[PDB]
């Protein structure tokens, strides 16, 4: 029973991962072949940069503005910066913008979304000059709409790139996210890779590799069939016509009679997919963004992401059939995620109830082997030995995301603190109780048993490997070898400031 269950789980997970790797490799080969035919100094299309931020650290905002200004693309109509400010404490963003760009900063007293006239000509009169807009605090949803309105002033603009206030762009980042748009007429959105730059925390160290693996496996597999459901907040590209078409549904959302605030990126990709358009993700575009270093903040972010995903999965399933043959892979991936979550929950419950040492050791060994294979693949792809630290991802995943998904499911249908971390605390207490029950029930020692010694040796080897990994990470932290090259430059610049 249990042997068959874990064997089937491991076989299916390995097969799906291998298929995703093959799909990502094929997509990368296709993108490389497309790029190989790109003429030198390609600037046929016109792009506009839209940046939105709120309560951003001054150094991060300045570095993002400098990185955007350092782009080597020779066809940029204008730079649009929309900040949900209109407050005394929000004037720092405008002051920083004036130090890096022109002083043409406007502070309209009305919001375009809430105004009877949605055209931006009432608040802006010049297109050639860069403009900064300060608006009352309404959310990221309203900030993007202002940029979209300001980017539709002239017909010359054919595409726009959305950049977060904490995103550091490469020299050719803009070109790599606009080139695939012209490759195929059906392509309307382009996804860019996002990489975590700070690795000074054990949580951030695992988050960086999780982001790398996600972007280079799942996004590539989705883009092979052109069914990407998330273009990426820090780095993403869109076409002007599809935005003009889907602006109204994206602002007039109605789920259960209340306007939604989360799901800023997933909903836009879902709206793009509902029109039958194709989205292609490219890995040659590199974007750097920060990651939270607090367990509670990471749990809250994961809960919000799970809420957005479970809200948008119904729309994804309902719109997948509009692509004909395409979308079958997307539906299969959604079903895979749902069945994987249910199977993980069922397996955990079965292990907790039975508390059999033989099943526990086998499951731990299978999970460790799968994670080791994934880490080896990541190291081979990234050509870096730091990918082997992904073996510690299982602990943080189990202790953070599962309660986050539980909370997301429960919230669909003192008090504020209970709504956030009480479920996580209950999950931790239940896990501890299950572990105590398992240890107490099997409180015996029999060195004459083949199976008992096998389980003991397996658990001892697992503990030794975990201890070795933690010791290696601690040694690397002191030596600061795990620090990314970009992080060191930022630290030096902050010191010399």
């Amino acid at each position, epitope marked *: 029973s249990a042997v068959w269950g874990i064997s089937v789980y491991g076989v299916f997970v390995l097969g799906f991962y291998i298929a995703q790797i093959v799909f990502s490799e094929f997509n990368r080969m296709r993108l490389s072949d497309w790029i190989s035919l790109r003429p030198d100094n390609w600037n046929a299309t016109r792009v506009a940069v839209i940046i939105a931020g709120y309560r951003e650290d001054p150094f991060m905002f300045k570095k993002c503005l400098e990185s955007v200004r350092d782009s080597e693309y020779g066809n940029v109509a204008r730079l649009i910066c929309v900040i949900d400010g209109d407050e005394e404490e929000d004037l720092k963003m405008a002051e920083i913008y004036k130090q890096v760009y022109n002083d043409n900063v406007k502070k309209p007293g009305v919001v375009l979304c809430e105004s009877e006239n949605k055209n931006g000509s009432t608040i802006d009169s010049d297109v050639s000059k860069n403009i900064c807009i300060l608006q009352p605090h309404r959310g990221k949803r309203e900030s993007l709409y202002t940029g979209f309105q300001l980017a539709s002033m002239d017909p010359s603009v054919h595409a726009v790139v959305l950049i977060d206030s904490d995103t550091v762009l490469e020299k050719n980042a803009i070109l790599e996210v606009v080139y695939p748009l012209s490759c195929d007429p059906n392509i309307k959105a382009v996804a860019g890779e996002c990489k975590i730059w700070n690795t000074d925390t054990i949580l951030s160290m695992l988050v960086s590799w999780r982001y790398f693996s996600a972007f280079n496996v799942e996004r590539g597999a989705q883009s092979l069939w052109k069914t990407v459901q998330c273009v990426g907040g820090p780095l993403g590209a869109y076409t002007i016509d599809i935005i003009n078409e889907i602006k109204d549904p994206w602002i007039t959302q109605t789920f259960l009679g209340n306007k939604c605030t989360y799901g800023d990126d997933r909903r836009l990709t879902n709206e793009v997919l509902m029109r039958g358009k194709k989205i292609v993700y490219t890995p040659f575009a590199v974007g750097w963004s920060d990651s939270p270093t607090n367990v509670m903040r990471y749990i809250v972010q994961q809960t919000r992401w799970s809420k957005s995903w479970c809200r948008e999965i119904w729309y994804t399933l309902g719109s997948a059939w509009k692509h004909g043959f395409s979308g079958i892979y997307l539906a299969f991936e959604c079903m895979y995620q749902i069945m994987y979550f249910f199977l993980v929950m069922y397996l955990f419950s079965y292990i907790a109830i039975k508390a059999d040492i033989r099943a526990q050791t086998a499951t731990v060994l299978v999970s460790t082997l799968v994670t080791i294979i994934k880490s080896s693949y990541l190291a081979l792809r990234a050509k870096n030995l730091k990918a082997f630290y992904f073996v510690l991802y299982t602990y943080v995943y189990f202790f953070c995301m599962i309660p986050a998904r539980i909370t997301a499911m429960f919230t669909m249908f003192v008090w504020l603190w209970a709504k956030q971390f009480l479920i996580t605390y209950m999950w931790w207490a239940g896990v501890l109780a299950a572990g105590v029950y398992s240890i107490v*029930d099997n409180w015996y*020692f*029999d*060195w004459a*048993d083949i*199976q*008992y010694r096998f389980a003991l040796v397996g658990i001892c080897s697992y503990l030794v490997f975990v201890s070795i990994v933690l010791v290696i990470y601690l040694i690397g932290k002191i030596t600061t070898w795990n620090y990314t090259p970009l992080q060191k430059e930022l630290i030096e610049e902050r010191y010399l400031h």
Partner: nanobody, 124 residues
Framework: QVQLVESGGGLVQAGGSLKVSCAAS????????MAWFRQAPGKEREFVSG???????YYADSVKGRFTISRDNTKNTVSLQMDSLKPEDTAVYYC??????????????????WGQGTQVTVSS
């Protein structure tokens, strides 16, 4: 501490089937390892069979297939089944229990707990 009591055992012809059951009462029978020993009238006691907590079955020499052992955790009892019995196998049988032990399991000193024992007699 577990108390071992045994039931069954009587006269039977050669080649018949006989079953002996040893009942153990304690805090947790599932975590204890049971074993069976026989003491010949003119020979010292020797190992016969034993079952571990993980349902691992061990058999002595010349009794690999003749003797079958099993345990049931619902009634917290262990029983031994004898098939194709020979008259040379008659002796008094004791059941033993053990929780902590080393690699040695065929010696009397390893098993701290012991039972009263039942004597079986067979005639050709």
């Amino acid at each position: 501490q577990v108390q071992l009591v045994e039931s069954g055992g009587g006269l039977v012809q050669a080649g018949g089937s006989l079953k002996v059951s040893c009942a153990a009462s304690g805090r947790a029978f599932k975590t204890y390892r049971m074993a069976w020993f026989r003491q010949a009238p003119g020979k010292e006691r020797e190992f016969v069979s034993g079952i571990s907590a993980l349902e691992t079955t061990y058999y002595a020499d010349s009794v690999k297939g003749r003797f079958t052992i099993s345990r049931d955790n619902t009634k917290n009892t262990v029983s031994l089944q004898m098939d194709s019995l020979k008259p040379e196998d008659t002796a008094v049988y004791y059941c033993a229990a053990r929780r902590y032990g080393g690699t040695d399991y065929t010696t009397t000193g390893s098993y701290d707990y012991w039972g009263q024992g039942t004597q079986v007699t067979v005639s050709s």
